[PDB]
Amino acid sequence: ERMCGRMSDFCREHKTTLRYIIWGILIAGYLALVIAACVMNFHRALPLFVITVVAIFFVVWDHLMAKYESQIARFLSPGQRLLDSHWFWLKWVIWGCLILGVILWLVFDTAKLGQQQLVSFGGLIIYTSLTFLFSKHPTKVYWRPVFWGIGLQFLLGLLILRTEPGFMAFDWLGKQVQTFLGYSDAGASFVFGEKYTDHFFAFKVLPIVIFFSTVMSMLYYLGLMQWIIRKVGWVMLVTMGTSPVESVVASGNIFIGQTESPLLVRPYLPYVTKSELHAIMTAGFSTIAGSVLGAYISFGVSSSHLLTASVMSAPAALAISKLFWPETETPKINLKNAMKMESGDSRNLLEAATQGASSSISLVANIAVNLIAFLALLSFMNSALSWLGNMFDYPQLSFEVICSYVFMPFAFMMGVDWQDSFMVAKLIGYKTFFNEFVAYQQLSKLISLRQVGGPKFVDGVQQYMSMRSEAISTYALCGFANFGSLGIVIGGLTSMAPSRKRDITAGAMRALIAGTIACFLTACIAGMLTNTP
Amino acid sequence: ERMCGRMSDFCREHKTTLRYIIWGILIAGYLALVIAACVMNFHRALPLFVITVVAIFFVVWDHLMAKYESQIARFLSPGQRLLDSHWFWLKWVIWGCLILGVILWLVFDTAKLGQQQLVSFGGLIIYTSLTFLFSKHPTKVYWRPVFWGIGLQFLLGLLILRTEPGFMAFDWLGKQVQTFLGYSDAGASFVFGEKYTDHFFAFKVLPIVIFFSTVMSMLYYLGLMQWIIRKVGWVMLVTMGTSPVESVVASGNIFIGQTESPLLVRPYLPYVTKSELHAIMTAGFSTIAGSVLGAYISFGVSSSHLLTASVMSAPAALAISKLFWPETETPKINLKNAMKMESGDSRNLLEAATQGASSSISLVANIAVNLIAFLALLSFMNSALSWLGNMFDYPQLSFEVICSYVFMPFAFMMGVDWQDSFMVAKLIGYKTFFNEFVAYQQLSKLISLRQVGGPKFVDGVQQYMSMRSEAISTYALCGFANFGSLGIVIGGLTSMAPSRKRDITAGAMRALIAGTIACFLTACIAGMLTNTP
Amino acid sequence: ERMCGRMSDFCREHKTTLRYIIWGILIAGYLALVIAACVMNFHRALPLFVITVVAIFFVVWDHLMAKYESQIARFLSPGQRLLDSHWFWLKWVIWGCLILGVILWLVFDTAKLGQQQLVSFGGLIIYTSLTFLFSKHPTKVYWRPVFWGIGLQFLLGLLILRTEPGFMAFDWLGKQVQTFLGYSDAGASFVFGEKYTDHFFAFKVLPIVIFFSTVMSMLYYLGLMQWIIRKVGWVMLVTMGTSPVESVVASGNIFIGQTESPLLVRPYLPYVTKSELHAIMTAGFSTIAGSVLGAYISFGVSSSHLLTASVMSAPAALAISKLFWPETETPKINLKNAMKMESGDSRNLLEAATQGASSSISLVANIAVNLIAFLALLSFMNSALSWLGNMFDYPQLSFEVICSYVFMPFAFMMGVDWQDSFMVAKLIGYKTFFNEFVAYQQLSKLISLRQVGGPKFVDGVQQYMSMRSEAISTYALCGFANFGSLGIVIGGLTSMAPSRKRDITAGAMRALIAGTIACFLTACIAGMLTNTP
Ligand SMILES: CC(C)C(=O)OC[C@H]1O[C@@H](n2ccc(NO)nc2=O)[C@H](O)[C@@H]1O
Ligand SMILES: CC(C)C(=O)OC[C@H]1O[C@@H](n2ccc(NO)nc2=O)[C@H](O)[C@@H]1O
């Protein structure tokens, strides 16, 4: 007993020192492994060295910003005062310079490019103007968020699309994600057998969802997802000027689904303003989760375009939310509270994986059931429309025919050519009435037909569309904005914050419209920047 | 801002006028389409014209009955008083006339028909007498509901079965329903692949359930299901004399399942009397839902017989409930409250479809699990019974052998011939211990063997049975009365009305017996009316 | 009415007499059937006669012990006092005799057996010593439970393994269970089609779980499971000296899973001590359910070893729980309350089957989801470890390689030979990080390779291992102790007794370690008793 007591006392004495010592030993062992690998053959060992270097750089940066924050603020203070003193005369100069730059760039580049892209820019203008017309509080609007959002979208798009180094990186990331979920496809062979490929959607696509949920929960427990979310949220906050919680939500949505995103700010959901709740719902509707990314890349959709669309959507979502529905009341929630996100209550990584996996049981079931019902309804609608058409001697009438004409103007404004606008309109109709999955499937079919080659027109029917139309379509459909999505979103938001039910419902409706408009804006920018093949 | 305010004021001014104007414009466009179709080719366009005419007639009738209700009641009042004044002497005359008519019809028709059907009528008498013997409150019974229920069953059966125009209509309706769920079968190919037919029950039959649930929810939101329920309920109410809620429930059950039917009167479930709760449960047990109709018609079961059985069951269910368990306490619920049914709380048709689809997730899982367990138990029972029989030198002993002899008297009383009564008894045993699905499958096998042709007896074993036996079997098995059904029914009823738990449990037991007896009565009438092949 | 009243009065008069009369008539009919079968052909009829005889014997024994308990206690009292008076000097004599017997048996048998088994005994000693070192309350420990637990394990193992009559019985029982769940496999063909074998795990293995749950619920309603649990619990109670509830739990766990076992003492869970809760969790972790037994026997695992391991585990679980974590507080719960187990609230056998089946819906879903996620994670881990290894010119690095070396000492102490210890270590790693299902699958592969024959080493890689190693592996892996299991166990225990949350969590962690150690002890004993092939 005495020896055990002495050992316990020794353990109590060295607690912090012992933990630091063991962590340091582990890190030193990792560094030794890295250096041995570099010694033997540097060319193979390069990735590990790069990862270690970037991690060290980020840790050093974080520590310095923490400790030296006051000194940096002191250094920055004089310049802010000097800018404020001269701001009155300088604001006009800055605005004029920006306008002149816009004019020069637009003329030279896009005029050397063609008409369709000039039309894309016109569509950008039209969408923004319309949102300003039908805003909830048109008189009181802050234009800095809108302008900065559009500018940031343009800069990101320009870098990623018109530069070779930028283009290669996203391709690499897409390949990584695709392989990462391919690891999932193999793991599900055990449960459903080697004949799981017989039923593709049920035994490949949904298991991908399951694996993604588990991985995300583990990373949440470790504390990485949070880091990336905080960085991007701080960027948006320091530039767009939005409130804290909405920026945090938007950054999270980039790689998180609509249902799980509000849980980031769950504790403060009761106290949020109506505008911030609208922003949350709009961000949820305007961006897709990471789970669907691997599947969509597998279909044939470009990885670079999908990732760029997801990244660009969040700033656009916030900008459109502010313009469509601006804030009229003071925000209670503080920056420190919002940025802080409570970690999982579980006790070990494996418990977090288990809990994350169990939650997915509901989502998959609801998805499968809704798909069954809505596709059956589409079949009934097509058969009945054909029956009605036969009366007027047009037996070819179908859902696709009405939705081609109804949605054509939106496609034309986005910069798609006249011939392909109808084909894009069919996909938009599929996205709005049904999930983006069906629409992406149809798009993949058109892409595959283009790649195989053959007659553009088998008969007076066009078979495949041009590459640029496909890129614009990729941007236009990268959202969770559906009518069934509206219901589940409302239900979840009401669950988390029972007090705010009616505010949640009212936000939902306008939010979905804002999300679709935000999705259109990214497509307009992509059309402006992508060259005609 | 001023222009927006002026537009909002103009919108506020014209609200009702604008809505009426747009609805009128839409209706006029529909009528123009109809008339154009009729102009070009009337023969093709006939269905649309017929639908429009009947819809207009019903709307006019409803409006007139609403506005002119007082005047019609005033016109009707004198005749009621005149009848009441002379009722004392006239009641004996009416009863004698009815008895004489019954005797004459029975003699001529059924005597020219044969012995089996006279036995069917005898079975009708026997079942009613037995229910009167074992009633909860034998002394206090109202005979008008019982007699009127039997009479209405007889009239409906006579019209539908012995008249050619009546026979054709139900065949047409069955074909419509079969095609309607065939639309479902196609829609489920997407999720489970084109090899979904490999697993027939899992990937065809259950998806049919899903599609039916979605369609029913949409129609509920639109407000059609409610209209039909109200019409049939009013008929039963004005003739049978039952209380409001039970009539409403019975009309709904005709095409609604046992689990969803009480939700029609959910708000008033706490306050219902014991007799009305027994009536609800009996109606639930005695009738089948619309989802199973398409499958059962697909197996080979006749559409006309299935639909006629479902329609006839509800009046029989109410009559048997009253005779078996009569009311001893005053009914609180009013007609207006009961007939009114709150519409779905959802916000658009698509939300209603989503919500209806999500609910079906539980039902399908429970069905599949119960089927797995109970069929495995049947296998074990057969193997053990064979093992026991081998001891006594009868290795052929099985579940079917015991259940052939045990249930034979019921089949004989229904009018089935002696040879086929055993075969029907096996099916009845399957229905009672297991769901009607298995029993209908066996019945379909026997029907198919009859249609193929061949030896009636391969050896001293009969292979197929006569057509009339199949019709009587179709009527006898059209119910949800099983022991597993008893449990889920009790659970759901207890959930909706927690206060009434014990009353719910006591009602359940007697209710199932009443339901089975009601199912037998329809078969007796069918045997009386169907001719010997 | 009067006749009904007279009949009701007559029924009231004869209630108990009538029930006894009918039960007696049924029993007499059963006996007549037995005697007729014996008359015709005794050889065939033997099983029924044996069952009847044993049932009669047990009923007579129970009745006599009930009625004559006081007289038997009176007879036993004098001997207890005489033993107590002389106990002071006699305890040393008894202990010395036991030690001498242990020495003689060990020397003769195991010395004539070989080194490996002497090492097995050494491993037994080592595990017990280590548990004594790291006990929660080392100073206060009661050694009688530990010693008696080890002794009872040894006696059961000796009888079952070294005697031919004992060996045959468990083989027979395993065949019975395997056929019993094979009945399940047939029943599931209806739902998933005859092509259900295409997806083996989803449509065979999980349906086995469903059928087992249903059968267990039915037997619980009838009252058999309870009888067996009570008998074994009384044995453990009268010998080990443990408290009532923990003994009852341990006996139940032998054939009940970790999740359902605490429901036996659900009403008293709030008031249990910390030590008893630790014992409950340890028993849950150290034993497997009956559902998995049929599957594991199907893989190729020996029936006799599996059943013996399950039986031996519970006494070991209690002993290890006491030594690892001893009780420091008085036990409130009484023997009578604990032994009594409330029967199911349902109303008939079929309701109990339905309720038992519905509960299984959650378990199967969670199992499938966790398997998908964890196997995908294993794939990712193997690929990344191979990538890291390629840097150091060892592309063969994998999960199995690390886990072979890490767990080798445990396998060596259990008595496995040096060459096969690594192979066993891989299986132990699979069991700890993933469910025992995967590990048993790998073990079945090794057994099948041994049976087929061929090169022991294809190259410097061993392909199959010796029979004794397989037996020790069978004992070592017969547990539910996994990390995912830890989470669900904690969740369920917290649900049943919300007051005890923190005590539940603290018990869980130590409990899992205790369970694994208990699993090792049974393997050590098996190695001591099994001869070298
Ligand atoms: C998931 C794929 C295979 C699919 O075909 O289903 C699409 C529907 O699934 C919703 N969805 C998706 C992911 C998520 N979190 O990762 N939460 C959601 O709600 C989403 O809105 C859409 O409607
Ligand atoms: C549904 C078919 C494919 C089947 O084989 O299953 C039969 C069992 O399903 C119950 N059932 C059915 C429909 C319903 N609402 O539409 N509610 C229910 O409870 C019903 O009682 C019976 O036992």
Ligand SMILES: CC(C)C(=O)OC[C@H]1O[C@@H](n2ccc(NO)nc2=O)[C@H](O)[C@@H]1O
């Ligand atoms: C069941 C087989 C096919 C399987 O591969 O799954 C293994 C996992 O299932 C857990 N399990 C099992 C039975 C039970 N009651 O009978 N309760 C449980 O928790 C158990 O712990 C293990 O982890």
